[PDB]
Scaffold this active site. Structure first.
Site, short mmCIF file in Angstrom:
data_model
loop_
_atom_site.label_atom_id
_atom_site.label_comp_id
_atom_site.label_asym_id
_atom_site.label_seq_id
_atom_site.Cartn_x
_atom_site.Cartn_y
_atom_site.Cartn_z
N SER A 1 7.40 -0.87 2.72
CA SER A 1 7.26 -0.36 4.08
C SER A 1 7.52 -1.49 5.06
O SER A 1 7.28 -2.66 4.75
CB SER A 1 5.88 0.25 4.32
OG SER A 1 4.94 -0.76 4.66
N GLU B 1 27.38 3.92 -7.07
CA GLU B 1 28.18 4.47 -5.98
C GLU B 1 27.37 5.21 -4.92
O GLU B 1 27.92 6.00 -4.15
CB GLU B 1 29.32 5.37 -6.48
CG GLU B 1 28.97 6.68 -7.21
CD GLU B 1 27.98 6.61 -8.38
OE1 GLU B 1 27.52 5.53 -8.81
OE2 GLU B 1 27.61 7.69 -8.83
N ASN C 1 3.25 12.14 0.86
CA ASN C 1 3.94 11.39 -0.18
C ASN C 1 4.70 12.27 -1.16
O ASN C 1 5.64 11.79 -1.80
CB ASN C 1 2.94 10.52 -0.94
CG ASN C 1 2.50 9.31 -0.14
OD1 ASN C 1 3.24 8.80 0.69
ND2 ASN C 1 1.29 8.84 -0.41
N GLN D 1 0.82 -1.21 0.00
CA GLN D 1 0.00 0.00 0.00
C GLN D 1 0.86 1.26 0.00
O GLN D 1 0.65 2.16 -0.83
CB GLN D 1 -0.93 -0.03 1.21
CG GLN D 1 -1.54 1.30 1.61
CD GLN D 1 -2.77 1.63 0.81
OE1 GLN D 1 -2.70 2.27 -0.24
NE2 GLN D 1 -3.91 1.16 1.29
N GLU E 1 -3.97 -6.87 -2.59
CA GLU E 1 -5.33 -6.39 -2.69
C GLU E 1 -5.54 -5.71 -4.04
O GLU E 1 -4.57 -5.26 -4.66
CB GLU E 1 -5.68 -5.39 -1.59
CG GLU E 1 -4.86 -5.51 -0.33
CD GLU E 1 -5.02 -4.30 0.58
OE1 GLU E 1 -6.12 -4.12 1.14
OE2 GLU E 1 -4.06 -3.51 0.69
N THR F 1 0.59 2.48 13.29
CA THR F 1 -0.80 2.20 12.97
C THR F 1 -1.08 0.70 12.94
O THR F 1 -1.94 0.24 12.19
CB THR F 1 -1.19 2.84 11.64
OG1 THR F 1 -0.55 2.14 10.56
CG2 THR F 1 -0.76 4.29 11.61
N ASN G 1 7.31 8.57 9.39
CA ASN G 1 6.14 9.38 9.08
C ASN G 1 5.89 10.51 10.06
O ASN G 1 5.28 11.52 9.68
CB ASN G 1 4.89 8.50 9.00
CG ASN G 1 4.60 8.03 7.59
OD1 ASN G 1 5.39 8.27 6.67
ND2 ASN G 1 3.47 7.37 7.41
N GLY H 1 1.99 -6.51 5.77
CA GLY H 1 2.37 -7.83 5.32
C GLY H 1 2.98 -7.87 3.93
O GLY H 1 4.06 -8.44 3.75
N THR H 2 2.31 -7.28 2.94
CA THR H 2 2.83 -7.33 1.58
C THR H 2 3.95 -6.33 1.35
O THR H 2 4.67 -6.45 0.35
CB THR H 2 1.72 -7.10 0.56
OG1 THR H 2 2.28 -7.06 -0.76
CG2 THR H 2 1.01 -5.80 0.81
N1 LIG Z 1 4.60 7.76 3.72
C1 LIG Z 1 3.53 7.00 3.49
N2 LIG Z 1 3.30 5.88 4.27
C2 LIG Z 1 2.22 5.10 4.04
C3 LIG Z 1 1.33 5.41 3.03
N3 LIG Z 1 0.36 4.47 3.03
C4 LIG Z 1 0.62 3.58 4.01
N4 LIG Z 1 1.76 3.97 4.66
C5 LIG Z 1 2.42 3.28 5.78
O1 LIG Z 1 2.12 1.90 5.69
C6 LIG Z 1 1.75 1.38 6.94
C7 LIG Z 1 0.57 0.43 6.74
O2 LIG Z 1 1.07 -0.88 6.60
P1 LIG Z 1 1.55 -1.41 5.17
O3 LIG Z 1 3.00 -1.80 5.19
O4 LIG Z 1 1.28 -0.37 4.11
O5 LIG Z 1 0.60 -2.68 4.92
P2 LIG Z 1 0.90 -3.63 3.66
O6 LIG Z 1 2.31 -4.18 3.71
O7 LIG Z 1 0.68 -2.85 2.39
O8 LIG Z 1 -0.16 -4.84 3.81
P3 LIG Z 1 -1.69 -4.63 3.36
O9 LIG Z 1 -2.30 -3.48 4.12
O10 LIG Z 1 -2.48 -5.90 3.61
O11 LIG Z 1 -1.68 -4.33 1.89
C8 LIG Z 1 1.36 2.55 7.82
O12 LIG Z 1 1.96 2.42 9.09
C9 LIG Z 1 1.90 3.77 7.12
O13 LIG Z 1 2.95 4.33 7.87
C10 LIG Z 1 1.55 6.54 2.24
O14 LIG Z 1 0.77 6.83 1.34
N5 LIG Z 1 2.65 7.33 2.48
MG LIG Z 2 -0.33 -1.51 3.58
#
Ligand SMILES: Nc1nc2c(ncn2[C@@H]2O[C@H](COP(=O)(O)OP(=O)(O)OP(=O)(O)O)[C@@H](O)[C@H]2O)c(=O)[nH]1
Ligand SMILES: [Mg+2]
Ligand SMILES: Nc1nc2c(ncn2[C@@H]2O[C@H](COP(=O)(O)OP(=O)(O)OP(=O)(O)O)[C@@H](O)[C@H]2O)c(=O)[nH]1
Ligand SMILES: Nc1nc2c(ncn2[C@@H]2O[C@H](COP(=O)(O)OP(=O)(O)O)[C@@H](O)[C@H]2O)c(=O)[nH]1
Ligand SMILES: Nc1nc2c(ncn2[C@@H]2O[C@H](COP(=O)(O)OP(=O)(O)O)[C@@H](O)[C@H]2O)c(=O)[nH]1
Ligand SMILES: [Mg+2]
EC number: 3.6.5.-
Lengths: 428, 87, 221, 430, 57, 428
Positions: free
Chosen positions: D130, D244, D218, D11, D61, D169, D196, D134-135
């Protein structure tokens, strides 16, 4: 051949010496751009005395313009003849002194004297043969009195066999321009009775009286004031830039005047200075210039010669004249005024001529006088210093940033030695 | 001036902090209401309205100081590199 | 090259600075936004303003007051685009003419920010000579926080000239009641850290603008 | 010529991609539909006149990729480049790494293989993930383990959204943070990481905007990654290639975790009132208030620093800007690196994202710094796990989806060894 | 706008000041016998001298 | 018929060569389209030295242009003078070196040595009589530092007797551009002390100091930075191309400046450097020209000559100038700086005067100096190397690409030998 290195310290020097370059650029027929445009070749053989060669007919003066602030340096770059100076000769610091000798001599000056000394020695090392130095400053402030004395003391230990002349301005009797004037003046003279060869004494109010009464000028600008000093300082050095029937250069005028190694405080004057409406009513001859040379109003210092005696006088005449009438005129002056000249010197008069007078006049003469009546100005500075110093006036701005009161006491005793020596030499 | 605070106090303080108000207090009121308003009321802030063309009596040539090229270079040096010490 | 830093503290600082920065852009050709519209040069505004790359001229002044209600009209007035909004520092409550408040209780934290902006202005400063602190002897922010600013700047910037202003309390009248306390409290800790303090009385100006400048019912102008 | 293949998983990665490609199709003059009314490094060419971006979008997703497929970007990306899962990983490393994440690696890897043969010289990977979910955690590791063997010794640099010291979160944040680092150590090269909360404090301190959202968040990261890959696209005085970043910022094999900092972050109102010389944005780069990673730099010592300058900048005053920093007694370096710095100059000024909040400025610095002071973030991230793993919190969702209990213990002792190695190399040798 | 070696340049600002200062203003009475007025003597002669010479900054 | 083959590897080499061929095309009257438009015949006789044959009345430079990454030569081809370069010397790969001495010398640069050797041999056997090989690169990078020394090792095998001049950019003590710079420079100079004949050390901060204190440039782009090195490069080999009244090619400089074969590191300098606004006040004549060449602040390298003693000195003068001043002030600068020279060599100055000046100048000169004050440069780089090696700070980007731990020790041993050899000869 012979060659003078010029220096301008403080606001007073940076204006007066700038006006000096203004008044001698036209004597040598040099445009603001520096291209030579003279009508006679005769004004071209001795350009190297004050200027420096550059290609295409360009001539560039030698002048290390120094002040602890840049504002008065940028004022003179805006003038009519401003671009002649070389920009790397411009030396300026960051913060001003504050009209205190202590900051101009110890605090800021020690962090800037090396560069101006290096530029001075760069100009002096590129010299065909060196004769002496030139300095324009005043004895009132800190950026012209704390820096000029330091520069003269630094120059003296490198070129001790040459002659340095400081063209100084002394404090005024009726009205002062700085509250800490005596404190600056006594410390400045303590560094000027020991180092330099001969200085000049200029009072502001004497020139004010000259342009009010003799010149009859209603609104005297500061250019109107500095032009007098420019003329009487360009008239002295004219014997090494133009031919003459009796040429007498700076070292010639040095042996002739000072009899004892501390009595070298001078007093200038300019002979032809007439009002606008009195041009047709006054004939122009040598006796009618000797009437103004020895005039007590025409003296640019505020001491009357009748309260003292002369040791030796000088009179650099300029122009169309024989010198039977010059010499017999000075003979008459020494005869009729006999009691005011010292008895222990038989001939009290030095004369010299050139046949190129200043730009815009027919005949001229520059009086120079080593009178014993100058002790009253030093006496005045002495009791002003005593009146402030007897119970601790404005001292902590000096005491708090570098020296104690023993230096002040030593300088005061050095000042009081000079008046006693003048008194002991006045009555033979 | 309505569009920047939308009759809201919070929007007004945000538009004050960000500088976004589009009306100066010279067009709306034909007198200074606030006393502190009279230190600007004569000045017309339209685009480049000058006190010389309108009211042509306060003209005065400036005896301004021209900073030299040497001092311009010195200012640029002391502003940019602190380790540079020319003269 | 030559320039000085203006600090306008309290009501008697900002309401005089509103006159000062009107007059300064009136002397030069600087427009209220700061975009001044062949001949010579002009570099006279460098004493008070600094030129940016965008052509805009920002004054060397910090508008600090613990009250919000009297600084805030310069954000609403004409000189909004003149100033940089990180100098218009406002608090939430005033000192209510307590020396103790603005010197010990509330004003003890705003110091780390006004010295921050002073460092910001001094880093852009080519050659710094003096300061211009516009305080009054009457209230709390002009007496308590001004003296704290002077005692911070005396140990911060060393030996630089610090010229302040003082609206001296009147002989026969006063605006507030606690003013004889505040004047002694603001001159006890300023006598050692200052260099020069200009002295201006109120009703002396009132009689001047009654007799010489013969206008009746005078006000702040 | 020069090339970059960028992978956006998760995400956070896809939402960051939506803004970095927003910037990228502005820097070069190409429309949202790939049409044109030095660009080969990030965009391909189709014989009718389209440029197709060289990136893949993959998420378990559909609900974040369908808005790309139905938005203003539907004619830019290749339809097969937007890989879509069907069930999410639900903040499990287990789901993204063993069960459902194993099903679609054969298509993402196929698409990367079909993207790596159309490029003449490829030299890097920009994986946008991130550490949280999970993903972004499991699938990123699963992609690392296959890209490290199917391609070889290419540069593999990742951009991650680190957990803030208190902002998070999710509840399983320490678990997903402790297991991704078991793949970003032996398979990674250098991890450009941000958090963040620090960007929130930047957006309310430096910018005068309250209540910020993810769209405003973002765009700063998009500007950061555009400053990173600026030298591959536009030429300058000192170009910097992807090969480098990895051999300048990484002293020791396991120590690759620099911070990021964009210097001129101001509003459109303040940019015209302040001149920004290169001697003060450089000092703003080392300012503790201007950090995009919540770790105040003055507890630790700097290892290596990289400066990326854009726009109308000249080498002399930046040279002087670093010259005044090594003399500062507050910014303290490590003894064994007397060299310290790295600069790179590009001539293109930064461009404002449409409807944006950043101002139109002429210079920009992007500061990348390995720092000893990041060891405190790991020191609290292990403390969180030790307070969580004591009573076996949330483990039955992990071991129930293809995981062993003993992996958590080996993850913990690996990260303890990482912290011990971090402390040992930051000592003064005598 | 000056010509240098026959080819024209364009100025933005010129040297010095448009006005004559008062610290560099000496009356002509010091040099009465002259025949072509020096530009330091009056403001009109300075203005014509500034018209004659143009140099950019 | 005394030709020079020009090589350039790395971003330094490409950009400095782009400026250098601008200078050489300006001197010989080459239009950027390639046509010859010189006005005198003196520019046509010895165009063989740097150029080759084209068709249609054009000339092609004898330069090979290589870089491992295709970005820099993409800019060089679209540069100001890039259309004269022959397309067949644009040899390259597809991936950058990435600031590695392992990625330029052993794996990635090793597969490109044959391709560049093809064009080098083709342009070397095409000539009449080669003299030397020019190389411009950087010791702190990865392409010019690693691959350039590999090229030098491969060229010294096939041409043992031909001389070699290298124009190397040297690291900085204040700031640093490459994080791993102490690891590449020691490895490059370890390959430079035993293969090359003639080496020039160029620093970038010395160029910054020149452009900020002498040239007075506020925004100095890299074109003005590289123009100084280009002017030095054109002034070293000016006698091969133009008639002179005291000729000196590269080999005469080699014999007069290398007393011992491992002491061949030079400090270049360009004489008539002055600010733009201060040109008309800067009357140039051989006194002030030979004064400007010998200050500490007109050196291309940061090592100050005042801390060391010169061994041998060369100075090639260009333009119509007489010889009495040249020899007389070499006598003056030898007898006034005798404390900075060695007593065991009687005459320490080499002079050469040609009759053709640089375009836009009329009396220029190029100062080449072998001084023992360059030991502090290698001392600081040995300290920077030993402060990184004892912790194995960045080692694994080398040992992972076919390196040894028994190579860094040999590099620092050769560094120590060079420093100790420079120091020993300072005792006399
Ligand atoms: N900087 C930034 N961080 C984001 C954004 N969207 C989500 N995040 C970060 O992503 C975290 C949410 O968990 P994710 O790692 O995105 O979850 P995931 O790995 O995508 O797994 P799923 O939600 O099932 O798809 C939050 O703690 C946010 O800090 C974004 O648009 N910008
Ligand atoms: Mg996510
Ligand atoms: N004439 C005039 N006097 C002013 C003005 N502003 C402030 N004063 C003076 O301020 C003096 C008292 O100081 P305060 O009003 O308490 O201001 P302060 O010292 O900053 O303290 P605060 O009121 O808390 O802000 C009064 O005697 C007024 O004369 C003004 O605009 N015009
Ligand atoms: N002739 C002349 N005298 C001046 C000028 N400016 C100042 N003075 C005189 O110099 C004396 C003190 O000058 P001062 O302010 O101390 O100059 P400073 O020493 O450079 O700081 C005063 O009595 C003034 O009358 C000037 O422009 N021309
Ligand atoms: N003087 C000068 N130095 C340069 C120039 N371009 C690059 N450099 C220097 O070269 C070094 C960069 O190394 P480089 O050779 O480009 O890396 P490589 O191409 O991978 O071998 C830096 O230390 C720069 O200071 C230039 O145009 N002039
Ligand atoms: Mg109040």
């Amino acid at each position: 051949m012979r060659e003078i290195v010029h220096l301008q310290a403080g606001q007073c020097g940076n204006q007066i010496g700038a006006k000096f370059w203004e008044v001698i650029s036209d004597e040598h027929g040099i445009d603001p751009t520096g291209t030579y445009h003279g009508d006679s070749d005769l004004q071209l053989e001795r350009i190297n005395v004050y200027y420096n060669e550059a290609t295409g007919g360009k001539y560039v003066p030698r002048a290390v313009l120094v002040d602890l602030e840049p504002g008065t340096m940028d004022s003179v770059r805006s003038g009519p003849f401003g671009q002649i100076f070389r920009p790397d000769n411009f030396v300026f610091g960051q913060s001003g002194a504050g009209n205190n000798w202590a900051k101009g001599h110890y605090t800021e000056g020690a962090e800037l004297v090396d560069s101006v000394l290096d530029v001075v020695r760069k100009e002096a090392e590129s010299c065909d043969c060196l004769q002496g130095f030139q300095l324009t400053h005043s004895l009132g402030g800190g950026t012209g009195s704390g820096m000029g004395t330091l520069l003269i003391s630094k120059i003296r230990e490198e070129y001790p066999d040459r002659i340095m002349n400081t063209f100084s301005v002394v404090p005024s009797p009726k009205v002062s321009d700085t509250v800490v004037e005596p404190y600056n003046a006594t410390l400045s003279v303590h560094q000027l009775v020991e180092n330099t060869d001969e200085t000049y004494c200029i009072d502001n109010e004497a020139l004010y009286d000259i342009c009010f009464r003799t010149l009859k000028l209603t609104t005297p600008t500061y250019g109107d004031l500095n032009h007098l000093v420019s003329a009487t300082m360009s008239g002295v050095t004219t014997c090494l830039r133009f031919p003459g029937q009796l040429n007498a250069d700076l070292r010639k005028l040095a042996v002739n005047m000072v009899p004892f190694p501390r009595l070298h405080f001078f007093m200038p004057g300019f002979a032809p200075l007439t009002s606008r409406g009195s041009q047709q009513y006054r004939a122009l001859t040598v006796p009618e210039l000797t009437q103004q040379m020895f005039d007590a109003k025409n003296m640019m210092a505020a001491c009357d010669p009748r309260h003292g005696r002369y040791l030796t006088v000088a009179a650099v005449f300029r122009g169309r004249m024989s010198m039977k009438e010059v010499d017999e005129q000075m003979l008459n002056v020494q005869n009729k005024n006999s009691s005011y000249f010292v008895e222990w010197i038989p001939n009290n008069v030095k004369t010299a001529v050139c046949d190129i007078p200043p730009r815009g006049l027919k005949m001229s003469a520059t009086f120079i006088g080593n009178s014993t009546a100058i002790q009253e100005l030093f006496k005045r500075i002495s009791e002003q210093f005593t009146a402030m110093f007897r119970r601790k006036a404005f001292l902590h701005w000096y005491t708090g940033e570098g020296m104690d009161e023993m230096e002040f006491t030593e300088a005061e005793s050095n000042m009081n030695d000079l008046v006693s020596e003048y008194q002991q030499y006045q009555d033979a | 001036n309505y569009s920047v605070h939308q009759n809201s106090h919070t929007k007004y303080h945000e538009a004050v902090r960000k500088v976004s108000l589009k009306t100066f207090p010279n067009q709306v009121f034909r007198v200074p209401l606030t006393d502190a308003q009279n230190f600007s009321f004569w000045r017309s802030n339209a685009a480049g309205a000058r006190p010389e063309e309108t009211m042509p009596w306060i003209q005065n040539p400036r005896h301004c100081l021209i900073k030299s090229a040497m001092t311009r270079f010195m200012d640029h040096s002391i502003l940019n590199d602190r380790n540079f010490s020319l003269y | 090259m030559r320039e000085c830093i203006s600090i306008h503290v309290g009501q008697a600082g900002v309401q005089i600075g509103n006159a000062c920065w009107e007059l300064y852009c009136l002397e030069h050709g600087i427009q209220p936004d700061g975009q001044m519209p062949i001949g010579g040069g002009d570099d006279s505004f460098n004493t008070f303003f600094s030129e940016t790359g965008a052509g805009k001229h920002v004054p060397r002044a910090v508008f600090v007051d613990l009250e919000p209600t009297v600084v805030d009209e310069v954000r609403t007035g004409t000189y909004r685009q003149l100033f940089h909004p990180e100098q218009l520092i406002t608090g939430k409550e005033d000192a209510a003419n307590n020396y103790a408040r603005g010197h010990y209780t509330i004003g003890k934290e705003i110091v780390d920010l006004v010295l921050d902006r002073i460092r910001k202005l001094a880093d852009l400063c080519t050659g710094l000579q003096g300061f211009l602190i516009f305080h009054s002897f009457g209230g709390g922010t002009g007496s308590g926080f001004a003296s704290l600013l002077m005692e911070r700047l005396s140990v911060d910037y060393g030996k630089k000239s610090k010229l302040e202003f003082a609206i001296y309390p009147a002989p026969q009248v006063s605006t507030a009641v606690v003013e004889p306390y505040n004047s002694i409290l603001t001159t006890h800790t300023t006598l050692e850290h200052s260099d020069c303090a200009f002295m201006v009385d109120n009703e002396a100006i009132y009689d001047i603008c009654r007799r010489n400048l013969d206008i009746e019912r005078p006000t702040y102008t | 010529m020069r090339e970059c293949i960028s992978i956006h998983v998760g995400q956070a990665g896809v939402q960051i991609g939506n803004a970095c490609w927003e910037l990228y199709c502005l820097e070069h003059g190409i429309q949202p539909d790939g049409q044109m009314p030095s660009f080969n490094t990030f965009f391909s060419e189709t014989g009718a006149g389209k440029h197709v971006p060289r990136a893949v979008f993959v998420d378990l997703e559909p609900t974040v990729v369908d808005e790309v497929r139905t938005g203003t970007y539907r004619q830019l990306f290749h339809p097969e480049q937007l890989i879509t899962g069907k069930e999410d990983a639900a903040n499990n490393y287990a789901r993204g790494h063993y069960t459902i994440g194993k099903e679609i690696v054969d298509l993402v890897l196929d698409r990367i293989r079909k993207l790596a043969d159309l490029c003449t010289g490829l030299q890097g990977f920009l994986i946008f993930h991130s550490f949280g979910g999970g993903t972004g955690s499991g699938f990123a590791s699963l992609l690392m383990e296959r890209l490290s063997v199917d391609y070889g010794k290419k540069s593999k640099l990742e951009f991650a959204i680190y957990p803030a010291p208190q902002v998070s979160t999710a509840v399983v944040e320490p678990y997903n943070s402790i297991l991704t680092t078991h793949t970003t150590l032996e398979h990674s090269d250098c991890a450009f990481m941000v958090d963040n909360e620090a960007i929130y404090d930047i957006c309310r301190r430096n910018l005068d905007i309250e209540r910020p959202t993810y769209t405003n968040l973002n765009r700063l990261i998009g500007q950061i990654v555009s400053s990173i890959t600026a030298s591959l696209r536009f030429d300058g005085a000192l170009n910097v290639d992807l090969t480098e970043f990895q051999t300048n910022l990484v002293p020791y094999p396991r120590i690759h975790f620099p911070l990021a900092t964009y210097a001129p972050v101001i509003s459109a109102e303040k940019a015209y009132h302040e001149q920004l010389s290169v001697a003060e944005i450089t000092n703003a780069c080392f300012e503790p208030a201007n950090q995009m990673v919540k770790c105040d730099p003055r507890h630790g010592k700097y290892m290596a620093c990289c400066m990326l300058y854009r726009g109308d900048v000249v080498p002399k005053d930046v040279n002087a800007a670093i010259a005044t920093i090594k003399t500062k007694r507050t910014i303290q370096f490590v003894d064994w690196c007397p060299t310290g710095f790295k600069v790179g100059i590009n001539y293109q000024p930064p461009t404002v994202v449409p409807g944006g909040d950043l101002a139109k400025v002429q210079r920009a610095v992007c500061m990348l710094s390995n720092t000893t002071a990041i060891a405190e973030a790991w020191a609290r991230l292990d403390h969180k796990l030790d307070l969580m793993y004591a009573k076996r919190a949330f483990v039955h969702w992990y071991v129930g989806e293809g995981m062993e209990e003993g992996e958590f213990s080996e993850a913990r002792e690996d990260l303890a060894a990482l912290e011990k190695d971090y402390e040992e190399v930051g000592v003064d040798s005598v | 706008m000056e010509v240098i070696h026959g080819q024209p340049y364009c100025c933005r600002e010129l040297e010095g000041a448009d006005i004559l200062s008062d610290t560099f203003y000496s009356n002509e009475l010091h040099t009465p016998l002259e025949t072509a007025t020096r530009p330091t003597a009056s403001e009109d002669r300075y203005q014509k001298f500034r018209q004659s010479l143009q140099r950019c900054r």
